[PDB]
Amino acid sequence: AQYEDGKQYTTLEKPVAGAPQVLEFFSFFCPHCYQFEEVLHISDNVKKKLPEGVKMTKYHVNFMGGDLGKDLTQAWAVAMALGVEDKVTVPLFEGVQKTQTIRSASDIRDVFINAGIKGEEYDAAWNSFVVKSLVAQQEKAAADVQLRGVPAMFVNGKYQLNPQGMDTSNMDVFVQQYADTVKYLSEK
Amino acid sequence: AQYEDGKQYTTLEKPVAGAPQVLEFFSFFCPHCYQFEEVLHISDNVKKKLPEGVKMTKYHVNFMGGDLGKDLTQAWAVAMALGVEDKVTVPLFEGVQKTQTIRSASDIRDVFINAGIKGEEYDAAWNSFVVKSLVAQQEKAAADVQLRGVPAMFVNGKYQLNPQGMDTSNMDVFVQQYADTVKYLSEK
């Protein structure tokens, strides 16, 4: 590939210090985020391409979905705090976008219960200051890269992936170009 | 049910002349479209309640899918041209969203071949003026109704279904409310 700023990636005007090496932002209301998760498996394929020691971080954003949007950011904080992201990502995406059965915080709670998280544990986490701090961390991270939309990925707080500039004829070629761009940027 | 403008349906500010009597839009990438068609069977339930003589039309759109999305819209034109919608809708939805076996146009072609459409016939239709025209027709219809998202349904180019307010405490009752609304608008 001939990597070029503006094509596969763009460069932040003011790089963020102490940023995660690979930082993804998403919303459970975001249609492309649904595709990135269920059909393209972007995070898994980026992980596979990168060295074993690279930290990948994934944060939820507030600006899709009204009040339920805020609740989902708090729920994603719960998931991070309990380490159950992989248990709830699909039923949260599908509950919001596919079946549209997630309408309130109670419905979000039911998803966690059905994914095996004990209700008492969910409630304790939901109300915890660990979770409150993770909510603040997600919001600050988005602010720091001046985030305007999702999905988004940032490498070393300097470079932003530009999927728009990639080939969309074949799903697996798209994923390969995306992951290979992350690898190129990571060792930049 | 007591029908009111703004409740079960809305009224287009700019009516579309010569529109199909009942016009549905969808995308094979769209999870709620999968829900509508593969789980709720909205098209089929609407059809069953429609007055005799009222035909249903269904067009594909491309909001998410880039070049592959365009391929899907052209493949849907082939399905319309060949009259094989009822043979390929299921394996196309499953292949895109569930088994992730549809990654490119070649995989779409394989679905038609497996459904009984010979490869040379699929290709002849793919490259036909009829299919080129059907692609233009799908695009133009979406533009005419100022299509914002999918799924969507329009009656007589005048009325837009509004499922948001409908009873969703029960997917069976939702389907009934939705199909009854189309029947009502068709009679108007």
Count of Cβ atoms closer than 10 Å to residue A22 Cβ: 22
User: Taken in order A167, A169, A175, A180, is the CA torsion positive or negative?
Assistant: negative
Q: How many CB atoms lie within 10 A of CB A133?
A: 12
How far off is chain B from A130, nearest CA to CA, in Å?
34
- Which residues constitute the domain of residue A132? 1-188
Place of tokens 């419905």: A107
A34 sits in the region (left: phi over 0; alpha: psi -120 to 50; else beta) called alpha
Say how many CB pairs under 8 Å bridge A and B.
46
Asked if A23 and A153 count as a contact pair (C-beta separation under 8 A), the reply is: yes
Residue of chain B nearest A172, judged by CA positions: B103
Q: Catalogue the long-range contacts made by B163-171 (C-beta closer than 8 Å, 24 or more residues apart).
A: B165/B7, B165/B8, B166/B8, B168/A100, B171/B39, B171/B40
Residue reference for tokens 């309408």: A103
Domain count, chain B: 1
CB contact under 8 A, A97 and B32: yes
Dihedral of the alpha carbons of B128, B142, B29, A161, in degrees to the nearest 10: 100
In B, which residues are within 8 Å of A31 by CB distance? 30, 63-64
HEC letters along chain B: CCCCECCCEEECCCCCCCCCCEEEEECCCCHHHHHHHHHHCHHHHHHHHCCCCCCEEEEECCCCCHHHHHHHHHHHHHHHHHCCHHHHHHHHHHHHHCCCCCCCHHHHHHHHHHCCCCHHHHHHHHCCHHHHHHHHHHHHHHHHCCCCCCCEEEECCCEEECHHHCCCCCHHHHHHHHHHHHHHHHCC
Residue B2: CB atoms within 10 Å: 5
User: Of A36, A65, A72, nearest to A153 (Cα)?
Assistant: A36
The CA R_g of chain A, rounded to the nearest whole Å, is 17
Tell me the CATH number at A27: 3.40.30.10
Provide the 8-state DSSP code for A5: B
Residues in Cβ contact with B159 at an 8 Å cutoff, skipping those fewer than 6 apart: B9, B10, B11, B12, B185, B188
Instruction: Pick from B103, B171, B178 the residue to mutate for testing the A interface (most A CBs within 10 Å).
Output: B103
| String of DSSP letters for A7-52 | TTEEE-SSPPTT--SEEEEE-TT-HHHHHHHHTS-HHHHHHHHS-T
